[PDB]
Write an enzyme that holds these catalytic residues in place. Structure first.
Site, PDB file in Angstrom:
ATOM      1  N   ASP A 168      -5.026  22.006   0.552  1.00 38.01           N
ATOM      2  CA  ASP A 168      -6.133  22.054   1.544  1.00 38.01           C
ATOM      3  C   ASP A 168      -6.464  23.208   2.446  1.00 38.01           C
ATOM      4  O   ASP A 168      -5.649  23.775   2.869  1.00 38.01           O
ATOM      5  CB  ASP A 168      -5.882  20.462   2.510  1.00 38.01           C
ATOM      6  N   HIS A 182     -11.421  30.039  -2.290  1.00 38.11           N
ATOM      7  CA  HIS A 182     -10.807  29.217  -3.468  1.00 38.11           C
ATOM      8  C   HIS A 182     -10.155  30.146  -4.718  1.00 38.11           C
ATOM      9  O   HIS A 182      -9.166  29.823  -5.258  1.00 38.11           O
ATOM     10  CB  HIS A 182     -11.907  28.362  -4.218  1.00 38.11           C
ATOM     11  N   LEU A 201       9.614  25.675 -15.143  1.00 33.22           N
ATOM     12  CA  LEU A 201       8.895  24.809 -14.346  1.00 33.22           C
ATOM     13  C   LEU A 201       7.468  23.997 -15.243  1.00 33.22           C
ATOM     14  O   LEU A 201       6.716  24.731 -15.836  1.00 33.22           O
ATOM     15  CB  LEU A 201       8.514  25.421 -13.095  1.00 33.22           C
TER      16      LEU A 201
END
Lengths: 223, 224
Positions: free
Chosen positions: B11, B28, B117
């Site tokens: 956020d 973004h 990962l």
């Protein structure tokens, strides 16, 4: 300003509180009961519609399962005089005879009351609540009472333990956790999915009307 | 002492861009850089899974979330593939645009054999919706007679959620991080995160880096 209609509370810190006062852990749960009485009365006067409360070893559980009996004898009459409606959520079939009967009497005593709903989460687990809801719905689908096309979030909501609360008040607006723990503990994962979370270091037996007002004040400053 | 699965609610991209007198798009792109930094660093530290959720004029916000995997594939995924990072998506695919679905699947197919990962993208994701979709599939398996309603347990439900594709011991986040100062979960992994440690920071997502990741892991270790 705006008082939150439904407040979830994870009542943590009774053991630490009692240790800090150099008393047995049993004294802490007793003082936790007092704190709940204070908080329940204050919230009812402030205009909170619902409080859902969650409690968090061999001889300790014996004293803890006697607390609903002690609640019924020494606290429930005053709450009933304050127009508080008492309900419970969770797997209450697991509870002892004396415990379930004390809680049932408290439900029956207060069932006509129109003020704040005090909702005891007892032998409660979020995932287990969801699990049993997803079971009953699948049984009803197998028995042709409901179609698999009718499965929605609203339907699931009707099968949770919070179904007995009024429809607009099922989900907490605020969830308070005491004793400094920044974690979830499987409390209302579905219903609390969008809730404002408030965390305080104060231990549950010290959580009083002032602590409640501070939490409500924090909630209003969010939006 | 590293948490195996970290949830992250990304956020503050819009706030970050508006603070610098720049358009929302700029925020973004900086968010994708933050994700690249965090993904590489987490992989280095030995984190097994990260599940990331892009959350915050709702029509505008939907365009940015859906544009993410197209741009991420072109500008970032190759370097993640070189770092042995596996990419997976959770959420509803049926309602995705064509270019977005192709970019996600290309990112998955590229990285599917990787043993480092697991970067788990939560896109078009809602927790309640996930649980509801799981019930639909379970309900249909009850009608097909593959299972009994008696077989419906917590463990079974786990196998039908969008996190089923993760290994069984890694499905649930140990830690959930939220940026931008908001103290909410916003319908993120409600089932899977039920016992998770929470970490809230005022830091905006594009400023969240390896250092902030380590400060979060530090806080997690102080809980024990």
């Amino acid at each position: 300003t705006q008082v939150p209609a439904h407040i979830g509370i994870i009542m943590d810190g009774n053991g630490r509180w009692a240790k800090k006062r150099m008393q047995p852990r049993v004294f802490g749960h007793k003082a936790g009961m007092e704190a709940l009485q204070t908080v329940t009365k204050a919230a009812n006067k402030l205009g909170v519609k619902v409080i859902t409360v969650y409690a968090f070893p061999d001889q300790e559980v014996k004293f803890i399962m006697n607390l609903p009996v002690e609640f019924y004898d020494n606290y429930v009459p005053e709450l009933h005089a304050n127009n508080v409606k008492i309900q419970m959520i969770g797997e209450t079939d697991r509870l002892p005879k004396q415990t379930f009967e004390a809680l049932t009497k408290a439900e029956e005593l207060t069932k006509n009351n129109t003020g704040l709903i005090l909702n005891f989460a007892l032998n409660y687990g979020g995932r287990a609540e969801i699990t049993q809801a997803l079971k009953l719905i699948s049984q009803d689908v197998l028995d042709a009472k409901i179609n698999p096309g009718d499965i929605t979030e609203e339907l699931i909501g009707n099968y949770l333990f919070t179904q007995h609360l009024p429809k607009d008040l099922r989900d907490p607006d605020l969830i308070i956790r005491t004793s400094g723990e920044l974690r979830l503990s499987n409390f209302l994962p579905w219903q609390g999915a969008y809730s404002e979370l408030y965390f305080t270091d104060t231990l549950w037996p010290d959580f009083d009307e002032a602590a409640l007002q501070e939490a409500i004040l924090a909630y209003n400053r969010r939006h």
